[model samples]
Structure formats: structure tokens, C-alpha cells
Target: MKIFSESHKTVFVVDHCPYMAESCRQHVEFDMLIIPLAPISKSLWTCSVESSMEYCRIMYDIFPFKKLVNFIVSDSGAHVLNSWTQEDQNLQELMAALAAVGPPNPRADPECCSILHGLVAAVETLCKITEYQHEARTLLMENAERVGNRGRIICITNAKSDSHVRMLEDCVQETIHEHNKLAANSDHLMQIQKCELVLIHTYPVGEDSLVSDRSKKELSPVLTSEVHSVRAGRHLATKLNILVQQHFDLASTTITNIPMYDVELLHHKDAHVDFLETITLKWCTPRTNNIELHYCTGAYRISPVDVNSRPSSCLTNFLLNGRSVLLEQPSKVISHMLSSHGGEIFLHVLSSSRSILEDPPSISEGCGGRVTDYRITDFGEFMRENRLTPFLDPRYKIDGSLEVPLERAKDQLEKHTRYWPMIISQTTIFNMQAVVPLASVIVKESLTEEDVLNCQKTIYNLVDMERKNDPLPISPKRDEQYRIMWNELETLVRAHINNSEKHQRVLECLMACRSKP
Candidate 1:
């Protein structure tokens, strides 16, 4: 979480392993790797290497100033792409670098993704970027006001196996230890800034005392993946974890907007043009008089399963547990829109790993058949029979009462939301982790045709059920007093997505409502 520096360098060592070719699965696989977790903006691109090349474009669409990248492809053994061309490359050359990523060899080997090779390569190259950084020694007057080169490496891979995982740990330690050993010299530049670390600690309350650094350490690294361990180190023989939450308290501003070609150059998919809108689930218990909804959004990322060589009950629990972890922070423009529609509460669609709307659901083949048959799949029916509906996102303004409108994720959401699947995952900027009760709901984007319609009907009914007997200033029925203009406006709900002219007209009507009282 380094603050924005004067200039920066980053390395992306993407795995060219055969599995990287895995499709829709791979889409969620590399989903959030380009979260711009590093500071700085302006990027470069490259191409159908599917997830790998597309990820480079994702970087180009929005990320740092300069980068040294590598693609780890296997020929006879774990290999590195563009091993020759040195000197940090800028925007366009990054787009062209994938051509050097070598030809396709979509062959899968259980041990093929030699994670160490790429891990070692990225560090060595990243270290070189630091050595060349000695230029910071200039202009002693300016030295007082600026910081030298800062670098971060993001290894994009679907790597697995504990053996390989530890192998990766050892390799990174060696590389950084060796590199830092050199950079530590007065003649050099530095790349040492701590990012993420995991800790096992001791607290006064629990039966479980936190283990100090002297135990066998285990980590399921796949979000920041092993990046969580980047800043963690062993203390002598004690394997104590050193956790660091690098909070960047940098202030923000309104730059207004980037015009014309500045935005035009980015590819739509890379720009995450369609990766917008999401729901929140505030999980809680009904018996406690404080139940909440922990909803998931924009597709169930089961990519955690991608790490499992084989899947089972352990796998199912893994998916279900992390499903409710939907995330995103509303940006200014969206905040303004929500302000305009202050009467409404926006929720992402209630979706499932499999379609919940289907007859019995398509997921009946699992060992949890009884669970789906009587539980989740027909949640709507079961609840209808049991006389219940799900909970809420913290709480919303009840002033809207019987009226609630669900929102479709606008194209701009990618500006906030980033994704990757679970298994000891770090929320790293995901706003969801702090939501109370830490739960999940079957949610969507990641939606099908009837899902939205179903969600709408249930919520409208949900609002109706919540209505109390008492009512208005003049009449008992809200419909009797104020249904006129709203029903007319409701007609445009369907039309807003249909007609461009009415979109403005509906907002105009909304403005009338807003400007009026």
C-alpha cells in the first residue's frame, strides 16, 4: 500500500502454463490481478493469449507508469518469455511485448507450472529495475523533496500444491534477500517497501492463544496469493508472522474527467467496461432480533477450487463460505446518482453458482441434493411456504416504504470492483470484509434472464409484507393518497433500459420529485 511515488516500476510475471488457457473459469481466475493495488496510472497492452495476454491489456487499461513484465511459458521446462530485452518499457511496447511471449503450447502437466522459475525471474528483473534506479543520487537539492524508485511484482498464476507453494516462498526469500543484500549498498537504489503480511497473535480472551513465530506456518496463497507473504519474514527459528496493514491515507480530488483518446485507447474488456454494479450482504441471525443479508455479487468466483487438484466436500464448503464476499466502493458519479434516487436502495441480483430459478435447480447432482431441494434452490418457494424473506444490507431508509427498486450494474462499476476467488483470501481494498456478521447470500453479474425479474418480484412482495396497518396523513392506503404519479413513473422502469429519450425523461421526472420537497 505504498503511497503514490514520483515514479514507479512493477513486474507482472504471468504464468503461461497450459491451465492459463482455461476459459470462463480463467476469466474469474485472473479477475482482479490488475486492481492497481500499486500506485500510479496510465498503462499498456498486448492480446488472445486469452487470460494471460488479456491481463496485460487489463494492466494497460488502468495501472502504473512503467513496468518490466515476463510471461512464464513451458518449453521443455519452466521458461521465461522476453528474457533478453532489458531497460524498463513504457505503454505501447508493453502492448507489443506479448508477441515475445512465445507460441502456444496448451499442454497441461500436473507439475508444469514451475512457480519458482517465474518467481525468481520477476525478482531478478525487478531488482535490476532498482539498480538502474541509482539515478536518484542526482540534484541534492531535489533529493530533499522526493523519493526514489519503488517497485512491486504481481505474479499472475493459477499455481497450486503445497510443495510448490513452499518452493515459491523459498524462491522469493532468496531473490529478495539476495537483491536487497545488493541494493543495501550505498551505490544502489532500493525496492524495499512492505505490502501485506499475515499474523497469528495472542489475545487475552480466547481459549486459543495466538501462536508466536515459533510454529509450523501454513498459508493458502492465491488472492494477493503469496503477495501476503511478501513482507512477512521469519524471526530466527521462530516462524512468527509479522502483519502489516499499509494504510494509505492519501487524500483525493475531483480531476473532473479524462477526455477523448485518453480513454479511447483502452480495450473495453480490459477497462472492465461491463464490470460494474454489485450487492452487499450484511449477515446476521434472525433469533437475535438483528438479522442481516450477506449477499455475493457479480458471479460466484469458485476459482479457489481452481487450486484444488480434485474437488470434494471441502471444496463445496470453501465456495459457499466465500460466496457472500461481494465488494466495491461507490464512486462519485454513482454516489450522485444514488443521491438523486435517495428514495431507493440498490441491491445486486440474488444469484447462485447454479441457477436458483430452475426447476429443482441444475445443481441437484451434488451430494447436497436434499439441501438444495429443501433449502437454497427453492429459497423463494421455501420462504413463501414458511412465510419469510431474507434480511437486509445493514439497514436502508424506510422512508421509501413499499417502494424498492433493484439496480443493474452500470458499465462503470469496474472503476471500483475487482475480483479473484477465495481460500484464505485478503479483502485488500474490498469494502465487504468490514460489513457486519460476515455472511453471504446467493447473488449475481453474473445473472441469468429471470434472476432479475425474480429478485424484483420478491423484494416488491418483501416491501409489501413489511407494511404495517397504520398509514398516512389523510388516508389508510398509501395507494389511495399517492399512487398516481408513481405508477406512471413505474411504467418507465422497464422503458428506461429500452428507450434513450425516456431515460432522460424519467430522470427529469425524478428531478421533479427531488426538486419538489
Candidate 2:
């Protein structure tokens, strides 16, 4: 392994293993001032130190646990604090760099890749050290169980045309699979541990690696190579980085807060599109920051076997291996005053999103277990061709009725939209190698439940807004077309027809009501 950059900035204390030193040096530039490898019980590294002066010359970045804790609390936090003065400047540069990402450039700067990798390594080391704390460990270990078990298993066969590439891809997949299995079934119990396994398939090339002049000239570096590839890589890395940072930041800030685990999958450079096209049957548990619970224990009854396409073994593994997080509502919030407490306030907001909560259909054998007249029900059989879910923007519900707290509702929608562009765009490439996706219905406003309903209302009142012989005409002859359009609208709403309508109306009314505020 080749070490990359060296930092002249400060004498940094490292807490990494001996085998990982070269990799860490390549990723994070630090001047080694202290070697705290006494806790490291590796015989070979210790033996090497005893036998040769070269061990001393290797530099002293590595540190003991106590020193590591002190430096992180004082040094790293200070970086954020000192940078506060030029916060705007830093943000401006950050945005500019993010905006500049494009096509896969094989000749991409290793320094950038190092930056991403180094950040991950640092967090992983920190997490291992902090696991000594009870709550922190518990939170992490639980999350690890969920993430490792629940993450959708993907099988990728390398394109037969390239054997070398295929070998690398297969190796990466195996690594991820093994890691997932390890994290899910670890012997460690008391601490919360969370981890996600991601397989990468790509070859290493030096900064001076030889390439054909034409090939080199054609490549333009963005994130990895181009916009799509780079964006996908950045997105996956971002998820991991964000989780790790959040874990560390939170632990540091409220040292006494209940520990939580966040596990995420990592992506390799190759097959970036595969991750996007991938879909899991279960919904992702959102960040738990808003889940205000004094106590939570996950134990729920499992639904019996639906003996059809999947086997009982599969279902059993899923129920047993999957993870859950529970929430308890604040009791005083039940005073009937809206927003009386965080729980009520949360529900009040969550219930308002048209698509946040969905109503389960009253399944009937005759209707193929679907609501009649819903487009998704009608076309569920042909989703692959249509590339759309059965339900469009379903709404939240309480007691089988459509609702979510208004704030939570908005939060979910915004979250979907924020992540939609990247996922929607990349999934296209996954489905068809050369296919570039237009904006998906999932990302389009007119495809939303509220949007379609508004369109219908607009059509109904077109006559009112115009003269008898206005430019637009609504004739009774258009009955069949109207019926078709109505079904199309229903498809967008999916199963949560009632909730969808309510969410849309609430949003419209809130916007109108809030104009004066």
C-alpha cells in the first residue's frame, strides 16, 4: 500500500491498527507525534519495535485511548469552532465543489478519494473506543442488527465480457456479504453496534498509471468519473459520513443522552447504478432525532406465512433478524390542545402529509386484494412495464383513517424530494445500461395526489373561469375521457386516497393561511 499525503499542520495522535497505518496515512494527513501502540497486542508489530530503530522512525501519530479522547474533544471541535468566523466562505467553497461533480474520470485525484476514506476510518476508530459507554454501545449494536439483517441482499454478476473487472466486483460483493453476516450475529451483547456491508468492485490505479492517450483525454473527472457516477458515489459516502458524524457529534454534545445506532451500506466505485435501481420491501427507519421516547423496546407479533412466491424459511429469517425501534408518546400532550407536547405536536404535523401515511386496502379475493378503481390496483400486474408503484403518494393514517401530524407529514415529503433526484436519475442507468432517465413520476409534481386533485378541480371549474364560448370547452361528450383521467388520478394517490386528499388540502390551506404570518 502506498501512503499518500503528509500533514505539516500538527502532531496528530492516531488510534489505528498497525496493518492499517499505510492506508490511513494515504487517507488522512497527520504528523505523527506519539505512538501509543502499547495497548496494541500484536506480536509482530511489538516484536518489530523491540528489534529495530526503524519502528521509532515510523513516526508517532498513534495514541492511547485516553489521549485519543482528549484530542478529539479539544482539537477537532476547535476546528469547527475556529472555522466559524469564515463559515460563509467555507460553505461557499463547499457548494462550489459539490456543484462541480461530473462523469467518471478514472484519472480522478486520489487525494479526494483519500479524504472520503480517511473520514470513514476516523469515525470507525472513534466508534470502537466509545463503545465502552453503556448507552452508546447499546444504541449502536441494536442498529447494527437491523441494518445488517434488513439491508436488501443484491446479487450482481459481472458483465461476461470483462473477466478482470468481474473478479474485482465478485470479490467486493463477497466482502460485503461476509461483513453483513458478521455484524448481524456478533457475540458482543451489552453495547449497541450498527454496521452496513457494502461491496466495491474497482481496480486501483496509481496517479501516474499508464493509459491510452485517447482514453485518458476522453475521461473527465467529477466525483468518480462523470456526474451520475460521481453523484452516486458521493451520495453513498455521504450517508455513511453523515451517520458517523451524527453519532460522534451527538455523543460528544450530550454525553448522557441515550445511545443510538445508525448502520448504513457503503458503495464501491463500480456498479454505482445498481444501488439506485435496488428497492427493498421494507421502509427505512428515519433518523431518530425526533423520536422522543423515554423508553422503547421493539417486540411485535409477526404476521403468519403467506405461502406463495417466498418460502417460510425466508419469512422466518426476516421476522427474527429484522430490527425495530419503539416510541412512547408524552402523556401530558393529550390535553386536547393541538401541539400541547412534542408527541402531539409531532403527530399533528406528521398526520398532515398527504403521502406520508397510507391506508391499507380492505383486501378482497375478487378485487385481487385491492381497492376497486385505483389505477395501481388495476395496473399492479404491469408495474415493471409502467415503472410505478401501485399507490401514488399514499397518506398517513390513525385507526385506519388517513392522517399524520402536520409537521411530520411535511418532513417526510421534503425528505423524499431531497433524495429523489439522485435515486431517480441513477435507477434509470441500472435498469438499462444506456438509458438516461427523465424525471420520474415519483419526482414530478403533477404526479402527486394533491397536484392531480387540484388539476381535476381546475378542470371542473374551467367553465366558471371563462365565457360560454371560451377557448376551452368541457363537453358532456368527454365522459369516457374524464373517467380515464379520474382513474389516472387515483393511481397517483395509491391506497391512501383519503389521506392524500387531506394532506394536499392542509398544505394548500396552510400556505394560504400563513401568507399573513
Candidate 3:
């Protein structure tokens, strides 16, 4: 029920059909001029006028319109010479009388009601009125050194015509001229502005149709770039809904264009990451002649799911509802980590957990199906522990292949030496965390090259010792032995293994010592 800004002066020129009658009923709450069309024949004119008045009456009963300036009627292709006069009844009196009677029967056939016409003539009338108002404002600016402005002209029609196309162009050009004049001479005027013309076609047009041809060739060139063609079934209710959106004031709202890239990006399987984090708003200030614009931003953080987690339905709904733009590519930082280090880490964890690199359960399967009865699968547990959602970054394929290899992980070892221990710990082999860090003192080069390699070595050595049937080097009777004693013994064994020409030779000596005990 909110009216427009005080500066705006809008007008609605609607076709006299059921579609437009319903549209008028919907938008009667707006503070704008309403001009309903009437036919040339007295009988058709009466029907059309009664229908529009019925709609107005219904709307006023519901929302109560206060800005209905006029009700002008015309013949098909006729000039604006005559008014909506019927037997001495002026436009206002006719509306007042018909509204008292209420609307027509709901069961009446819309097709039999009347085929709409006279859009071109009605638009011509609208242009002349807007120009006269503009001229009046210019005169006032000259006389009183002050100016006013006009707003939007919304013409809703579903007619086929090339009539008055050239004349409409001339009016638009003159309006633009006045707008430029107002911009150039601010001292003589306050807020002199051009009127915006919106053409809302109630039905969509086929490429070869006359309406389509006129729209592309004649109408598009003259009108503001606010043309919209909407169709919802073949029902009057559909057209009414379409007009409510079409007739909205665009100057005070955001204009959204769903570009091709954004459409494809939304359907992209791997474009995961917090979309809220990626977007930024820019408040754009236009040039001297251009209108101002406002910008807005929204941010959010989502909990990470499994790499094989299905797309977030809740998140999808949020984006769709917000009309937020999806980026063509996901975050590079998250993608890089998943592709490089995550790939190797995931594979290493799986190897240590004694599991093959096989497929996880289908996305439709509940978590009970994906997780193990024992400790969760190393990969699943890793995702769960780190709060990282799986498979959202394009880095990981549907079959768990990393798009980028782990070559950079070697560089990470040298650059970030402190992180090696954490990566080693996550390998999750029994005692591997402690052994790898200690082993690094003897074979620092291997540990520094790639921590995963050191983990593989420790795991491989355990398999070798068990294969050689070696028993524990320390006895349970030595429960009194302090932590320092075991730590020193582990250091000596690591040093000896590194000193040997081959690790197998050091293993052989340890096996011998265990055999003798």
C-alpha cells in the first residue's frame, strides 16, 4: 500500500480486456494516474467501461486507490479527440455510477467479452499528456525559477499494431531533449526529468507474428529498455499476476539480469564453497546525467560435508530465494588445498587404515550407510574432524581423483616444516606420529621431502618386523623403566638404521637381538 516518492507522477494505460481489467484491480493501490480504454461502438464501449469500473470498484473495496487521475476512452486507431462520454455522463460520473453496481458475473466468457484494441491510440494520448506536463513544468521553471518532474508511463496491452510507431519515437526524443536541458541548466530548474516508458505485453509473441515484428522493429527502438512480455497459461489471472511484477517501479529497486555464466555455474556439480564469502557489493555512483544506484552484500558460512556429500538442498533454496549470483568457479584457496594436499592425505589415510581406494556409498544413502560400525573410515573421519565438506571443490572428481596432483606438497615440506608433524599425526597408524618425528632426526631429508613418505616408511618397517617374526624389544617386567629410557632407546635405533648402507641391514640386527632375548 506504499505510494511512490513525492516526485513521481505515473500513468497506467490499460487495454479494456479481462486481462487488463484484472491487472488494474491488482495495482489500484499505486499512487498513479489510471486511464482505462473504452470502445468506439456504444454497446462495446458500455461493456468495456462497465468491466473496468467493476474492476476499480472491487480494487477500491479491497485496497482503496486515491490517485486515479482520468479515464480516457477511444476507438480503434482513433485520435484522442473524444472523451469517455456516454449520454452526458463524463468519465468520473460513469466510474462512480458503475462502481456502485459492482463487477460482472464470474462465469462470463472472457473470449466472448471482447478482443482488445486501440493500444497505439491510447499510447499516443499518454505521450501527448506527458509532453504537455513537461512543457508546463518548463514554463513554471522559466516563470518561477523552479521545476517539477514526471515519472513512468506503463502501457499494458496485447494487441498487434505498427500504428503511431514513428510518432511515439518523436515524443521520446523530445522527452530526452528536455531531460538533457534540465541536466545542463540546474539554476533555472530544480529536478526536471524525462518520463520512463514501459511496454508490458500481456502475452508472449511468436517470431513471425505481427506483434513480434512490431515489438522488435518499432516498439523496442522508441520505448525505455523496460519492455517485458509475460504469459501465464491463457487465463486472466495469469496476466494479472504478470502485470503486478511488470508495473513495479524499477527506479527504487534492484535490476537483476540472470547472465548465462551464472546459470551454468549454479548447475555446475563442483562449484562448492561458501558463496556468501565470495560476493562483494559495490555502491555505484553514476555520471552527471545518469541516475544513482544502490548496492548490497550478504555473507554466510556453511559447515563442510563429506567429499561425496550431495548438493545442499537448504543452501540451494537460500540462493534461489535471495536471487544471488553464483560464481562460475569456486574459491581457488579451498580448491588448491583439496586438490593437492587433501588428495595425498586422503589416500595416505586410507592406506594406513587398511582399506582399498574404493567408492563410497551413494549420496542418497544415509550417514549410517556411509560410516563404518568400527571407527569411521579414515577419509570420512578426516572430513568429519576438520569440519570440511567433501567433494564440493572441483578439485575432487566423482570417483575421488584429484584434478591437481600432490607435487606442491614437497614444496610445502620445506616451506612449512612445522606442519609436517600435524600431517604425520593424521596418518593415524599406531605410534606412527611419535616414530615419524623421531625418525626425522636420522633421515631428515626424506622427512623434509614429503611427510607422507616418512609415514609410508614407518608403516613398511612395521610390516617387515612382523614378517621377520620379531618380538617386542622391551619386557613388561621393565614397567619401572621411565619415559626417558624408552625415548633414548628409540633414538639409538633410529640413528643406527640411518647409519647402515641399507635399512634392511639395520632391521636384520634388531631381529637378531630380539631372537636372542
Clash count list over all predictions: 14, 43, 6
Q: Score each candidate by Cα lDDT.
A: 0.33, 0.26, 0.35
What's the lDDT for residue 94 in model 1?
49
Deviating ranges (above 4 Å) for candidate 3: 1-8, 14-66, 76-147, 156-158, 161-192, 202-225, 230-236, 245-517
Which structure is stronger by lDDT: 1 or 2? 1
Candidate 1 lDDT by residue in tens digits, 354-381: 4455576455575644341132332343
**lDDT (tens digit, per residue) of candidate 2 on 1-517:** 0010111011111111222112111122243565533332222212211211111111111111111111111111111111112232132343343234211233434223221222232222222322223333466665533321111111111111234333433443344444435534654421112222222111111223122111111111100111011111223233333332232221111001113211111111121221222111222233436655322111111121122323423333432443222221222121100111211111011111134336665467554453333434323323343343344455756566665446554644553334221222222211221111211322233346655555445434432322242332221334443343333333333423234455355334433432121
Backbone collision tally, model 3: 6
Query: In angstroms, how far off is 276's CA in candidate 1?
Result: 20
Tens digits of per-residue lDDT, candidate 3, 25-73, equal 1212233345754422222223334434443332222222222323333
Ranking by lDDT: 3, 1, 2
Instruction: Return the top candidate by lDDT.
Output: 3
- CA lDDT, candidate 3, residue 437: 45
Give lDDT for model 2: 0.26
TM-score ranking from best candidate downward: 1, 3, 2
Candidate 1 local accuracy as lDDT? 0.33
| TM match of model 3 to true structure | 0.25
